């Protein structure tokens, strides 16, 4: 055969991301002395739209503590913040929506977002619209905090990792149908070249493992092994179950 | 009660002297034929003195403490009253409603106001009045 499409996507020629209208990378402020010991105050100047991203962005400007200068950071907007608002960041910040606190300074049940996985990587977890992380316990010895992630899984983080109080704006986005191929076109136009999708059963055997034969079919089962060799991984990759997750078809 | 009296310090809010401090000399709650609104004849400073340390010699000390005054008629709506005061009786008979015509008389009033403000800036009175408002 020939090289198939999911193999072809890794050389990254026409499959790279479309990043022209994007505002910049959205990450937290760099951890330093002021956030490590006290707090610092900035002000949010504008809330803007970012191309290829469901959640809006916030432009929070702070002061440089070693030079007479201003520093502007790009945050992801939590639901409720507005222009002209003060944002406090650091160890001694108060528990208000929009503030940036370490995870060892929040009580149980607190709703945080844009959470660092390691202390100092400036935001990794719960960054899409409508998502959040729930604090579900602490460990004062061993300096660890237990969290629940948006997928349902549980994780244990160092208490020096930071997070922003609140839920990320833009929720309820997928509750609307698209209704139109043109709407899907204009959606993926600002992300990457991955739409439309031809089915593998509609190709020839040179192009795909599922291609060929009269009466379009997959000849064998579609569950692949985990140790397949990268031209074979087409289907359901390492599935532990199949079915409906609902068992009733109607609720 | 009625607090906008002579000797009360205010801040000019708009009109080329915005941000400058001001002493009220003569109030007019009713307003004349000209200026039919409630207004006040005031005196203030356009050029503030600069900071002075131990390092400056006597000539540069004398240069860095000059004061440039102004006199003005200003609406009550364009003033903002403070809680500080000042003693206004030095230049009290020189600022009148006939002074604001015949600009030789305005020069003559400005000289008296300049002398009195420099005398009070000496001997350390009213540092709030002789400091700048940063905005």
């Amino acid at each position: 055969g020939r090289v198939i499409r999911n193999q072809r996507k890794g050389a990254g020629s026409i499959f790279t991301s479309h990043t022209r209208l994007r505002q910049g990378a959205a990450k937290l402020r760099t951890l330093d002395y002021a956030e490590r010991h006290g707090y610092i105050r900035g002000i949010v100047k504008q809330i803007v739209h970012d191309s290829g991203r469901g959640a809006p962005l916030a432009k929070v400007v702070f002061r440089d503590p070693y030079k007479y200068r201003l520093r502007e950071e790009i945050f992801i907007a939590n639901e409720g913040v507005h222009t002209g608002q003060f944002i406090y960041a650091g160890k001694k910040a108060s528990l208000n929506v929009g503030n940036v606190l370490p995870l060892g300074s929040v009580p149980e049940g607190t709703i945080v977002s844009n959470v660092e996985e390691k202390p100092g990587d400036r935001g990794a977890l719960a960054r899409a619209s409508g998502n959040y992380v729930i604090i579900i316990g602490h460990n004062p010895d061993e300096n660890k905090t237990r969290v629940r992630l948006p997928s349902g899984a549980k994780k244990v983080i160092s208490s020096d990792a930071r997070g922003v109080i609140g839920v990320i704006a833009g929720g309820g986005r997928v509750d609307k149908p698209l209704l139109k191929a043109g709407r899907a076109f204009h959606k993926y136009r600002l992300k990457r070249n991955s739409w439309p999708k031809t089915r593998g059963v509609a190709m020839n055997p040179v192009d795909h493992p599922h291609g060929g034969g009269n009466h379009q079919h997959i000849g064998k089962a579609s569950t692949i092994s985990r140790g397949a060799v990268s031209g074979q991984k087409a289907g359901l990759i390492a599935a532990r179950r199949t079915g409906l997750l609902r068992g009733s078809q109607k609720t | 009660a009625k607090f906008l009296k002579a000797g009360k310090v205010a801040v000019v809010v708009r009109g080329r002297y915005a941000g400058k401090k001001v002493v009220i000399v003569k109030p007019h709650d009713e307003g004349s034929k000209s200026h039919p609104f409630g207004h006040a004849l005031v005196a203030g400073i356009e050029r503030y003195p600069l900071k002075v340390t131990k390092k400056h010699g006597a000539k540069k000390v004398a240069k860095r403490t000059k004061i440039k005054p102004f006199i003005k008629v200003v609406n009550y709506n364009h003033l903002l009253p403070t809680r500080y005061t000042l003693d206004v009786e030095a230049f009290k008979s020189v600022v009148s409603t006939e002074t604001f015509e015949q600009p030789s008389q305005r020069e003559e009033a400005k000289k008296v106001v300049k002398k009195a403000f420099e005398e009070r800036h000496q001997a350390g009175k009213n540092q709030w009045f002789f400091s700048k408002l940063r905005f």
């Binding site: 002021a34 440089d64 503590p65 070693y66 | 131990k54 000496q122 001997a123 350390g124």
Partner: peptide, 29 residues
């Protein structure tokens, strides 16, 4: 003398710009 006025700075943790200190412990040699 009385034209000079003392005004001590608040080098704080969020108040003023920090002064120049001896950073010889943190030089990238």
């Amino acid at each position: 003398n009385p034209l000079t006025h003392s005004t001590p700075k608040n080098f704080g943790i969020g108040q003023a710009v920090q002064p120049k200190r001896n950073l010889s412990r943190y030089v990238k040699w």
